[PDB]
């Protein structure tokens with residue numbers, strides 16, 4: 001009944017202009033909120049433990065990403081226009097953060113294999129492709145972690161379930177020609193990115209889709225994809241940019257429905273005895289801390305699911 005949480009203090013240590021769209025403080029604030037829950041509550045103290053990652057090895061990245069793309073980012077030589085498409089100014093701290101977060105999704109996988117359920121307090125970089133970055137993504141932690149997971153003995157088949165409001169295009173292109181990683185994306189069709197190469201299965205929702213349509217579809221599609229593919233491991237992107245107050249997403253999902261989504265996902269994995277490694281994914285609010293209660297729903301779901 002232990003739930004590993006994966007966190008590194010470098011996650012919010014990036015220097016960004018104010019006004020920058022990326023809610024860089026949410027990671028440390030979410031971590032601090034959980035630290036406070038643990039002081040307040042015997043249940044949170046007893047049910048969760050933290051695991052700090054070290055940077056991912058470069059050999060774990062280059063099976064998915066082009067080496068010259070990797071090298072250009074390592075050396076801060078990525079052409080200016082390509083770096084802007086990523087959406088961050090280059091710095092060594094950005095590279096160190098990224099590699100640590102990739103390491104973290106990989107650790108979440110090992111931890112999920114051991115305990116059943118593990119949550120990464122970062123991650124979900126589904127817009128990175130083999131040879132370019134976009135949409136705040138440099139390297140694709142989900143695909144990287146799925147490829148790594150397949151190196152392990154118990155795992156032959158990985159299902160990535162992406163509930164972030166944006167299409168997992170990078171993940172789609174990275175896994176399109178491999179039958180050992182299956183990609184499922186739910187998303188708002190009119191949100192970024194414009195071009196949506198096929199996942200294994202895609203569910204695109206109209207603007208202002210609300211709780212019942214989203215949840216009924218999520219429940220049935222996920223249950224089907226789990227039955228169809230019988231994965232050894234699920235990677236679950238629990239992005240909260242589906243939320244009705246998100247500043248980028250165009251869906252109308254409530255915090256209550258986010259909770260029900262996470263409860264359902266985690267409860268299915270448990271019922272089926274499939275290890276599930278979770279990434280908190282995206283979320284956009286100029287009030288970065290406003291994302292904290294939305295992401296915390298994943299933890300409340302895991303807490304309830306584990307039996308407290």
Ligand SMILES: O=C(CCCCCCC(=O)Nc1ccccc1)NO
Pocket residue numbers: 084085086087126127134135136164165166192239241281282283
């Ligand atoms: O959370 C997300 C990130 C979505 C990426 C942001 C969408 C819009 C965007 O990146 N536009 C853009 C980028 C560079 C320059 C101008 C616009 N996906 O999971």
Ligand SMILES: [K+]
Pocket residue numbers: 149150151152153154155156
């Ligand atoms: K294997």
Ligand SMILES: [K+]
Pocket residue numbers: 162163164165166167168185186187
């Ligand atoms: K998605």
Ligand SMILES: [K+]
Pocket residue numbers: 175176177178179180181182183200
């Ligand atoms: K595939």
Ligand SMILES: [K+]
Pocket residue numbers: 242243244245246247248249250251252
């Ligand atoms: K919205």
Ligand SMILES: [Zn+2]
Pocket residue numbers: 164165166239241282283
């Ligand atoms: Zn998103």
